[PDB]
Write a protein that holds these residues in place. Sequence first.
Motif, PDB file in Angstrom:
ATOM      1  N   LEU A 238       2.327   2.931  -2.464  1.00 51.37           N
ATOM      2  CA  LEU A 238       1.885   3.794  -3.555  1.00 51.37           C
ATOM      3  C   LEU A 238       0.670   4.619  -3.134  1.00 51.37           C
ATOM      4  CD1 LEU A 238       2.043   5.036  -6.192  1.00 51.37           C
ATOM      5  CD2 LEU A 238       1.061   3.011  -7.312  1.00 51.37           C
ATOM      6  N   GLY A 239      -0.300   3.946  -2.528  1.00 55.18           N
ATOM      7  CA  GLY A 239      -1.485   4.620  -2.014  1.00 55.18           C
ATOM      8  C   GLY A 239      -1.168   5.657  -0.965  1.00 55.18           C
TER       9      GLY A 239
ATOM     10  N   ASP B 218       9.338   1.252 -19.606  1.00 53.82           N
ATOM     11  CA  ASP B 218      10.269   0.165 -19.735  1.00 53.82           C
ATOM     12  C   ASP B 218       9.899  -0.848 -18.675  1.00 53.82           C
ATOM     13  OD1 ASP B 218      13.744  -0.004 -20.595  1.00 53.82           O
ATOM     14  OD2 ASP B 218      12.556  -1.578 -19.659  1.00 53.82           O
TER      15      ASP B 218
ATOM     16  N   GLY C 147      -3.545   3.446  -5.934  1.00 52.14           N
ATOM     17  CA  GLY C 147      -2.773   2.768  -4.904  1.00 52.14           C
ATOM     18  C   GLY C 147      -3.592   2.345  -3.696  1.00 52.14           C
ATOM     19  N   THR C 148      -4.469   3.216  -3.209  1.00 54.54           N
ATOM     20  CA  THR C 148      -5.170   2.885  -1.956  1.00 54.54           C
ATOM     21  C   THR C 148      -6.076   1.673  -2.145  1.00 54.54           C
ATOM     22  OG1 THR C 148      -5.050   5.155  -1.143  1.00 54.54           O
ATOM     23  CG2 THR C 148      -6.754   3.751  -0.174  1.00 54.54           C
TER      24      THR C 148
ATOM     25  N   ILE D 293      -1.014   4.726 -16.830  1.00 56.02           N
ATOM     26  CA  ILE D 293      -0.186   3.975 -15.915  1.00 56.02           C
ATOM     27  C   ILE D 293      -0.261   2.483 -16.201  1.00 56.02           C
ATOM     28  CG2 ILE D 293      -2.023   3.862 -14.074  1.00 56.02           C
ATOM     29  CD1 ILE D 293       0.308   4.053 -12.015  1.00 56.02           C
TER      30      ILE D 293
ATOM     31  N   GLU E 146      10.118  -2.467  -6.565  1.00 56.27           N
ATOM     32  CA  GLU E 146      10.639  -3.083  -5.376  1.00 56.27           C
ATOM     33  C   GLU E 146      12.042  -3.569  -5.670  1.00 56.27           C
ATOM     34  OE1 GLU E 146       7.632  -5.772  -4.322  1.00 56.27           O
ATOM     35  OE2 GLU E 146       8.350  -7.522  -5.475  1.00 56.27           O
TER      36      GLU E 146
ATOM     37  N   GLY F 279      -4.065  -1.586  -2.608  1.00 59.84           N
ATOM     38  CA  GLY F 279      -3.536  -1.986  -1.303  1.00 59.84           C
ATOM     39  C   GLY F 279      -4.639  -2.528  -0.412  1.00 59.84           C
TER      40      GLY F 279
ATOM     41  N   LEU G  33       0.737  -1.023 -14.119  1.00 61.12           N
ATOM     42  CA  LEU G  33       1.169  -1.614 -12.866  1.00 61.12           C
ATOM     43  C   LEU G  33       1.292  -3.120 -13.046  1.00 61.12           C
ATOM     44  CD1 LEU G  33      -1.467   0.595 -12.415  1.00 61.12           C
ATOM     45  CD2 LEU G  33      -0.298   0.649 -10.212  1.00 61.12           C
TER      46      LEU G  33
ATOM     47  N   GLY H  11       0.782   8.732  -2.678  1.00 64.45           N
ATOM     48  CA  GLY H  11      -0.090   9.501  -3.553  1.00 64.45           C
ATOM     49  C   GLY H  11      -1.226  10.178  -2.795  1.00 64.45           C
ATOM     50  N   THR H  12      -1.675   9.565  -1.701  1.00 63.99           N
ATOM     51  CA  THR H  12      -2.755  10.153  -0.914  1.00 63.99           C
ATOM     52  C   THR H  12      -2.282  11.345  -0.090  1.00 63.99           C
ATOM     53  OG1 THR H  12      -3.892   8.055  -0.858  1.00 63.99           O
ATOM     54  CG2 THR H  12      -4.589   9.727   0.738  1.00 63.99           C
TER      55      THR H  12
ATOM     56  N   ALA I 165       5.579   8.963 -12.835  1.00 66.15           N
ATOM     57  CA  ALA I 165       6.071   8.192 -11.713  1.00 66.15           C
ATOM     58  C   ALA I 165       6.771   6.919 -12.110  1.00 66.15           C
ATOM     59  CB  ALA I 165       4.929   7.877 -10.741  1.00 66.15           C
TER      60      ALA I 165
ATOM     61  N   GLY J 236       0.784  -1.231   0.000  1.00 68.27           N
ATOM     62  CA  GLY J 236       0.000   0.000   0.000  1.00 68.27           C
ATOM     63  C   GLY J 236       0.819   1.287   0.000  1.00 68.27           C
TER      64      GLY J 236
ATOM     65  N   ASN K 223      -0.489  -6.579  -4.312  1.00 71.84           N
ATOM     66  CA  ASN K 223       0.819  -5.922  -4.207  1.00 71.84           C
ATOM     67  C   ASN K 223       1.343  -5.481  -5.575  1.00 71.84           C
ATOM     68  OD1 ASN K 223       1.382  -6.375  -1.037  1.00 71.84           O
ATOM     69  ND2 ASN K 223       0.650  -8.348  -1.878  1.00 71.84           N
ATOM     70  N   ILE K 224       1.890  -4.274  -5.630  1.00 70.34           N
ATOM     71  CA  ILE K 224       2.440  -3.719  -6.846  1.00 70.34           C
ATOM     72  C   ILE K 224       3.917  -4.049  -6.934  1.00 70.34           C
ATOM     73  CG2 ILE K 224       2.958  -1.651  -8.111  1.00 70.34           C
ATOM     74  CD1 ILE K 224       0.540  -0.455  -6.208  1.00 70.34           C
ATOM     75  N   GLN K 225       4.337  -4.702  -8.019  1.00 65.52           N
ATOM     76  CA  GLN K 225       5.734  -5.121  -8.157  1.00 65.52           C
ATOM     77  C   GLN K 225       6.575  -4.019  -8.779  1.00 65.52           C
ATOM     78  OE1 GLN K 225       5.507  -8.830 -10.275  1.00 65.52           O
ATOM     79  NE2 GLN K 225       5.106 -10.019  -8.408  1.00 65.52           N
ATOM     80  N   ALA K 226       5.991  -3.362  -9.768  1.00 68.15           N
ATOM     81  CA  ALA K 226       6.597  -2.247 -10.456  1.00 68.15           C
ATOM     82  C   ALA K 226       5.442  -1.467 -11.055  1.00 68.15           C
ATOM     83  CB  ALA K 226       7.567  -2.746 -11.608  1.00 68.15           C
ATOM     84  N   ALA K 227       5.645  -0.173 -11.243  1.00 68.88           N
ATOM     85  CA  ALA K 227       4.642   0.664 -11.887  1.00 68.88           C
ATOM     86  C   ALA K 227       5.326   1.868 -12.536  1.00 68.88           C
ATOM     87  CB  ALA K 227       3.593   1.120 -10.869  1.00 68.88           C
ATOM     88  N   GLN K 228       4.735   2.334 -13.616  1.00 69.32           N
ATOM     89  CA  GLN K 228       5.261   3.512 -14.282  1.00 69.32           C
ATOM     90  C   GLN K 228       4.073   4.261 -14.839  1.00 69.32           C
ATOM     91  OE1 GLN K 228       8.423   2.336 -17.121  1.00 69.32           O
ATOM     92  NE2 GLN K 228       9.430   1.045 -15.558  1.00 69.32           N
ATOM     93  N   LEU K 229       4.064   5.553 -14.545  1.00 67.36           N
ATOM     94  CA  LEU K 229       3.022   6.437 -14.966  1.00 67.36           C
ATOM     95  C   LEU K 229       3.656   7.521 -15.826  1.00 67.36           C
ATOM     96  CD1 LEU K 229       0.398   8.053 -14.809  1.00 67.36           C
ATOM     97  CD2 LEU K 229       1.269   9.008 -12.621  1.00 67.36           C
TER      98      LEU K 229
ATOM     99  N   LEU L 206       8.354   3.424 -10.049  1.00 66.49           N
ATOM    100  CA  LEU L 206       8.525   2.758  -8.780  1.00 66.49           C
ATOM    101  C   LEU L 206       8.735   1.283  -8.983  1.00 66.49           C
ATOM    102  CD1 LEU L 206       6.212   0.893  -7.079  1.00 66.49           C
ATOM    103  CD2 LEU L 206       4.837   2.888  -7.713  1.00 66.49           C
TER     104      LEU L 206
ATOM    105  N   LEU M  36      -3.514   9.207  -8.364  1.00 67.67           N
ATOM    106  CA  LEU M  36      -2.618   8.070  -8.146  1.00 67.67           C
ATOM    107  C   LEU M  36      -2.807   7.490  -6.738  1.00 67.67           C
ATOM    108  CD1 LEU M  36      -0.512   6.150  -9.302  1.00 67.67           C
ATOM    109  CD2 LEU M  36       1.257   7.747  -8.632  1.00 67.67           C
ATOM    110  N   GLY M  37      -3.080   8.371  -5.780  1.00 64.29           N
ATOM    111  CA  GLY M  37      -3.367   7.928  -4.427  1.00 64.29           C
ATOM    112  C   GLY M  37      -4.530   6.961  -4.358  1.00 64.29           C
TER     113      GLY M  37
END
Lengths: 527, 527, 106, 105
Positions: free
Chosen positions: B466-467, D25, D48-49, D74, B487, D52, D76, B470-471, B483, B464, D57-63, B485, D44-45
């Motif tokens: 990212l949430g 990429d 993600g929220t 985006i 792991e 979550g 993910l 961003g929040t 953005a 969570g 679970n997010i492994q990688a993301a690009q926006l 990101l 974006l919040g």
Amino acid sequence: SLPVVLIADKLAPSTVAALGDQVEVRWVDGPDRDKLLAAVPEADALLVRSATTVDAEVLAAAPKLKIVARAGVGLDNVDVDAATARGVLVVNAPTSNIHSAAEHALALLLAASRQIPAADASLREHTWKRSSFSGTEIFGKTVGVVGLGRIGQLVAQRIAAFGAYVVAYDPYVSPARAAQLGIELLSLDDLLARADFISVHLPKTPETAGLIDKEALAKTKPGVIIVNAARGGLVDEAALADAITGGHVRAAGLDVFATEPCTDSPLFELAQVVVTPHLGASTAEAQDRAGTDVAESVRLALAGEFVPDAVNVGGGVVNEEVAPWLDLVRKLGVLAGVLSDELPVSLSVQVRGELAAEEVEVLRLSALRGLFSAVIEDAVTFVNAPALAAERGVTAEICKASESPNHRSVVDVRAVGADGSVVTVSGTLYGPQLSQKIVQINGRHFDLRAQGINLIIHYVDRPGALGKIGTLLGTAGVNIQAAQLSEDAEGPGATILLRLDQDVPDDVRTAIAAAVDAYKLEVVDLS
Amino acid sequence: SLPVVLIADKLAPSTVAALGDQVEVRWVDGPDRDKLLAAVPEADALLVRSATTVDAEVLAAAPKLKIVARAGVGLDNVDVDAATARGVLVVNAPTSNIHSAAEHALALLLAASRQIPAADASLREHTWKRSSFSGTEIFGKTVGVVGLGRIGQLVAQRIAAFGAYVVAYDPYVSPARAAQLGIELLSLDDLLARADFISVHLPKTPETAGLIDKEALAKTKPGVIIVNAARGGLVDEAALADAITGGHVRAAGLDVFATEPCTDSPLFELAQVVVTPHLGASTAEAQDRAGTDVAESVRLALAGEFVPDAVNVGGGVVNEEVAPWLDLVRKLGVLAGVLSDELPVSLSVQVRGELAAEEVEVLRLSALRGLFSAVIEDAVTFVNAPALAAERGVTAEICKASESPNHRSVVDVRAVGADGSVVTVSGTLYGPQLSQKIVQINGRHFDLRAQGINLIIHYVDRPGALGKIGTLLGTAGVNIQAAQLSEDAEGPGATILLRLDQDVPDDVRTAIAAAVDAYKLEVVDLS
Amino acid sequence: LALLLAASRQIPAADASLREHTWKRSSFSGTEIFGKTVGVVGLGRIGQLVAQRIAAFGAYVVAYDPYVSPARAAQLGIELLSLDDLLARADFISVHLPKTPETAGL
Amino acid sequence: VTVSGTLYGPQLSQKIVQINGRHFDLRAQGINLIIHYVDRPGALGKIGTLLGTAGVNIQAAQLSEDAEGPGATILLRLDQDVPDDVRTAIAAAVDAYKLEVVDLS
């Protein structure tokens, strides 16, 4: 009246064209003693390869000799002490063989991994034993470079293009320099554990001799291929044979032998070991370069210019006031390096008091020579600072101050760590004999001969420590000539330095460390 | 046809004798616009002091201008953008005032510690108020140097001979460089706590402006004397007055003001504050040196030689293929410096793929310019690498490789730490518009505009995240433009980079750090 | 040292002009010390200390004191001279209690 | 619709490098959620929220931000699928023009 340059070994006029049109170049059959001795009286410079021996007899016979130039890396055939003794600049061609030697290390590594000689032999005996051979692939493997001087660096660069990962062991390269090369610096133990290939690139010094012994061979990865085109004996020949025969190391390549000429090695009975009669520099390109290098050194030297590749000190090069300081300051560099936790990134040499009025740049070179002695061969006295800085990542500066606090002159060597910590060691000369004295270490003052085997201990358990140490040493039969000890100004620590009449066996060092709870224990020879 | 050098301000022929006999030198009344504009069409070079303004009008009117040289340090009177825009090399005399400025800082420190002006005034009013004064002794005291560029270094050297202990704050000098100077590097907080005297030697950048505010003044030692002969406003003028009046800081000396001409400062009502109308470089020696410096730069530039003191890029100096890369690579240097834990000891710039065929040494300078932006003033584009290396202890190299793994060309900036750790950042340009893209950070690949306000976070609490981030940002009203990101490949960590439309208030940064358990949180402006 | 610098950079006058709310920057022109030759007349201890502080400004120091230890002088970075030679060569002069009080002249 | 890919490096790892003029990429593997939506503060919040909150679970993301427009796009890569109701909520939360999930194994 044109200066005479005498060539006593097989160097072509073209090879030596860097000499101007401002010199008379003559040739002589150097190996023929009568000829040489008859030709040398008139010589201003003498160039030589490996076949002519430039001993005291030659030097005594050459009254106007200014330079002896060896077109090569070794100095075995020149008495550098006698040359210095008579004010004769000695020069070599220190980087002339680096590409041929790197290429030969690689040649040997591939020839061993793929059994080239044996395979070539089978076809030479008119049979086809393709099914018999099995090679080893370099791609993706880890290659351990033991010693990261110039040549070890070139080998790492070439091997990396094969898709190998490169690790190195060399306490004498900065971490930042290794990181710039994209090389991971490791303890020797860790290199041994990790390496699928090992290439040794150490100089021969007693710090180095037989480095890779049976104990070491037993730590390597099963299947290792090991190459030594560096110095005879770095890898223990009999231990190798054992490890080869036993199967643990798959193959090896050697270009150099504990003693050469070598014709009777047991290794010669082993197929999985590729061997060459010290061929690393046997290349027209390397021999030509050795010559054009040395031809330029001789030009600079005759032009009263500065000679980067100089090996010693000879001529106006250094005042009579300064001259005796060279050896002291070398010893300060040794000491500052030993007292340091790791390789300093730089040496600051402070010259204070009367000596500060002199021309003292050579002192900066002495310090560096001392710091790096473990990777410098004895004959050399001067080293090329710019090259050292670029190759290994360590620099030196000189600073002068009119005032010396106590002695009329003192030289302080500050060894500065990458983290900004500083180790300081000072010496003076004084007296009719100009005895060399160490007079300070890290803010503690004393007066001890800069000579002999010195033991230095930083430790934490204080009461009765003098007794414990002196009792262990004397039970080992070790005489204690002189001593300096003091409890730290701030902290639980204390320090002691002792001059001994012999080295300290490892077990007893372990006992002493244990007895006083030492955090640092070192033995350095300052002779 | 001899080249024309036009001098538009008060520089004597003798001051400018470094120009050869190979030029025609003329003078003009620069401040007189009609004269200047009439004289400049024929000029190959233009030297100027501070009185002539070299704007676009001047430049448009000078069709063969190759160099604008400012005999001084500032560039306020020259439009460097317009000059670059038209291929005109701009030069200054960057080190010409250093001794006069150092001496003036010392002058101000002593004048404040011993109340020279007031005392001189009392005797000037024909009275004897010896009993009234009480000075402060420097011997044995700790002196805090805030900023250890060239001038701060000279001040430390001079003050150290007074028997003062010297400490410094400068995140932009290596620890090894400070240790070579015999100076202890401190956090600003620790310098504040320890210093009996403070001398500021920062450049003006928004990183720097009002650095020493009320919060800072309140951390200093009671009785501090504080000097600023650096840039107006580094010490908050009103906060100083408060601290002076309240008694906490005993005295101050100022040569520079938040805005000048300054005639109405409240500080001018305070006796315990010594003030001078920006006199730090008001010295015949400094003005002469500014001139002879710039006369040499102009010689080198007309000799098609290389101009160390260059401030921008103009002429053949750089290919059309390379030119667009300068600004990208500057941004990679900024980024590598921000992503680093401390100042790297060096930058390795790797140029790969098609760009590798170009002449790319300037790219090495761009990287360094970027790394050091926090201590470089905007107008300057080029910096002198050798001087930077000697002054601050950081170097750069370029390496080329034919192959780029993915993009046809990429530039990687490797920032190497003294401990051998490495931070890597890469960019490319591509497309009809050649948009600048950041494409890698430490082995993670992506494609993000090299522009705007970027927030970068390394953190440990992942699910969570990212949430959460961003929040928090969006509750603060902050837009998130782009953005990236991921792991971490190995470990509990994760990393994220975001382009924002505005900066992030400190409390919210604290909230974000707390929310995802960050170990690194940075905001960098890449515009 | 304070006085030498204040006289060199006209500090008191410079400070005063600001105190009467004028910007007289273009009225001042100082003397740089770096590289200049500084004459110390008399080498009692304070004089010796001045020589040392002065040398750190990159100035060459000469002094007149015919009773000071020549070796002490050289340790201080000082070139000993006759008073005539000092006056001839000096860009700055600081006068001090000599080593042999008080037959110092005028 | 235009989608672009490349391969590079010693493994020759497959990368998604472009969707409709936006650059990325990202490994061409696993479950990938693609969203094209209206950039508002908070957007974006919310994405993600919700992910979550759902235990995804997010492994990688690009926006990346659109070249010209209100929008953003985006990608993910997720450790599991996103339930329909959660995709709907996500879509609503951000006025998505498009929302899709694809397995790229």
